[PDB]
Amino acid sequence: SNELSKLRMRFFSALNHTSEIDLHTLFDNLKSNLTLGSIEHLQEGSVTYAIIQELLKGADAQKKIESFLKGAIKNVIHPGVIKGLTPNEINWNVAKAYPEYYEHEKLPDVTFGGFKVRDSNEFKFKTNVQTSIWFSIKPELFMPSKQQEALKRRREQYPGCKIRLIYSSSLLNPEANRQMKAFAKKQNISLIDIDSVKTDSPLYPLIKAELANLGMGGNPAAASDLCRWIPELFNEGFYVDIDLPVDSSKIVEGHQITGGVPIMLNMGSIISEPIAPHHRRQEAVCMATDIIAYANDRETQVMMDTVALHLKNIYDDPYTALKDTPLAQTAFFNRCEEEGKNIFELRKGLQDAFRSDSLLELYVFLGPAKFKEVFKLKETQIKYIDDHISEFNEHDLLLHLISDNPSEINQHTLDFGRAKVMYMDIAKEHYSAFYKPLVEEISGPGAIYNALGGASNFTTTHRRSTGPMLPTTPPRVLQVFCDAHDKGPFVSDNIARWQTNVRELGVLNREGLSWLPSVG
Numbered sequence: 001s002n003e004l005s006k007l008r009m010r011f012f013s014a015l016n017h018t019s020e021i022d023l024h025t026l027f028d029n030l031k032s033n034l035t036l037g038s039i040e041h042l043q044e045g046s047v048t049y050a051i052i053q054e055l056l057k058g059a060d061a062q063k064k065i066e067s068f069l070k071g072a073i074k075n076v077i078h079p080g081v082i083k084g085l086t087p088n089e090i091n092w093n094v095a096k097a098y099p100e101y102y103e104h105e106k107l108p109d110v111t112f113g114g115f116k117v118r119d120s121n122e123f124k125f126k127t128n129v130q131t132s133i134w135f136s137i138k139p140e141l142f143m144p145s146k147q148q149e150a151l152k153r154r155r156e157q158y159p160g161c162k163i164r165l166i167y168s169s170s171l172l173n174p175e176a177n178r179q180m181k182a183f184a185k186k187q188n189i190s191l192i193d194i195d196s197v198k199t200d201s202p203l204y205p206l207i208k209a210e211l212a213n214l215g216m217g218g219n220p221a222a223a224s225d226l227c228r229w230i231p232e233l234f235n236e237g238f239y240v241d242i243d244l245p246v247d248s249s250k251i252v253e254g255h256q257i258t259g260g261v262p263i264m265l266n267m268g269s270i271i272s273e274p275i276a277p278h279h280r281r282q283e284a285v286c287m288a289t290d291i292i293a294y295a296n297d298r299e300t301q302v303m304m305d306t307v308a309l310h311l312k313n314i315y316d317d318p319y320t321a322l323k324d325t326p327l328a329q330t331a332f333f334n335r336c337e338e339e340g341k342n343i344f345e346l347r348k349g350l351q352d353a354f355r356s357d358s359l360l361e362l363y364v365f366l367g368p369a370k371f372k373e374v375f376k377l378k379e380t381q382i383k384y385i386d387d388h389i390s391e392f393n394e395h396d397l398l399l400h401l402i403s404d405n406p407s408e409i410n411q412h413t414l415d416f417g418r419a420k421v422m423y424m425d426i427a428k429e430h431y432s433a434f435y436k437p438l439v440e441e442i443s444g445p446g447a448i449y450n451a452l453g454g455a456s457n458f459t460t461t462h463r464r465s466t467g468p469m470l471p472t473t474p475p476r477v478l479q480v481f482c483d484a485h486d487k488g489p490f491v492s493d494n495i496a497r498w499q500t501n502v503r504e505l506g507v508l509n510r511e512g513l514s515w516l517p518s519v520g
């Protein structure tokens, strides 16, 4: 039959059409327990292939290779394929099963979310259950067309995948609520209203506050970020950003993957410029939360609680989490910290300063140090301004900017109205850098990275090859066992690929984010 023909052709391709042994005899002797799925793990680049190549150089190669492959397929590869193991995971399991044929180091001790990463493949994850989140900032609009179309494109392409959607009914007017419910019914989507969830999570009040405070420093992406760490909302399948495409070629037929931790995230890594004292590059793992996988396991709730306790701590005192951000160098931040202002008041105050259309208000907000930096002033220039600021009106301050640095605005200094706009525009260049950490380091991937162990814990001296990748260093352990993006069928552009050089990240940084409030 064509099935046997297809299998045989795949096998001969995998083993490089070698004539050093008789592949017909070998194929015939293995075919009783050989599937297309297993043959992938015999290909060049695999541990199994590497072992075969060394056996070819020794005596009795025909028999030794048959004995090796029969056992490797029966005991390691085929069981791995059925369980949803990746090629990396199968390579490791083969190396472990055949220490006489493959020299390797032991699994290093790596801690991720308070848990030692395992190579047991014991945590199981469903790829056919997907949850996304949409909180509308416009009461008349349940969801924009882009997001509706994204969900349809996932539903029409795939059943029988279960699609769950968290939203807020309180954010929608009655018509929009009816439309949301109608949409979800038509698309066979399980709807979850965040307004009435039963949970004891400390994150739940914070989510409700983020949404209640829209227009007053709340943020719907921050609300969405926090939902992902409540066990009543997420306990199996994947979280995926609502608009992530599915890569059909990556769908696993058993709809199951595994990992070495009970919660996996989107990961990559960045190889640094050389650092002191040996002029060597460092590999630093990077992570994102646009794809999260949750194991069907009690340990999932345990790990999630560690992260939730960290996020609660950040919300309760955000100034530590923000200590190294641009905003931390402003007078406004220092005042807020002394006053114990909350995250909403911090975000709203920043937005207010940049909506003020006032250089004087911007000065009071930034303080002299950051005002100096933003407007590229000399120390003597900012000293004079700061000494006399209690006497200035708006025009007085503009006159000093014009005298001190007309080049910044290409000597368009004769029209004061235009000059003011140009200086305000220079300041607005920095708004995104001030604002984004107020989500990223608070509820976002910055906070989560820290919750799970922080940079130091995920950064190591860069080391390369040789041969098939094995989990024998910390970044390789995370790459093999902890990365939801590689294993899942969802497409992301949020972060660098694994082992990307810092000078060529190839990540688009978008300007008009959905969750950045405008400042004009």
Ligand SMILES: O=c1ccn([C@@H]2O[C@H](COP(=O)(O)OP(=O)(O)O[C@H]3O[C@H](CO)[C@@H](O)[C@H](O)[C@H]3O)[C@@H](O)[C@H]2O)c(=O)[nH]1
Pocket (backbone or CB within 6 Å): 132, 133, 134, 135, 136, 137, 220, 221, 222, 224, 225, 241, 242, 243, 289, 290, 439, 440, 443, 444, 445, 494, 513, 514, 515
């Ligand atoms: O009006 C909005 C806007 C955003 N969101 C939520 O926020 C998520 C991210 O919004 P997106 O426009 O994709 O922003 P990005 O900056 O591209 O998102 C990144 O940064 C966010 C904040 O940390 C994270 O929530 C995302 O997972 C991450 O991909 C969405 O999927 C929604 O869940 C809403 O619910 N309502």
Ligand SMILES: [Mg+2]
Pocket (backbone or CB within 6 Å): 241
């Ligand atoms: Mg996005």
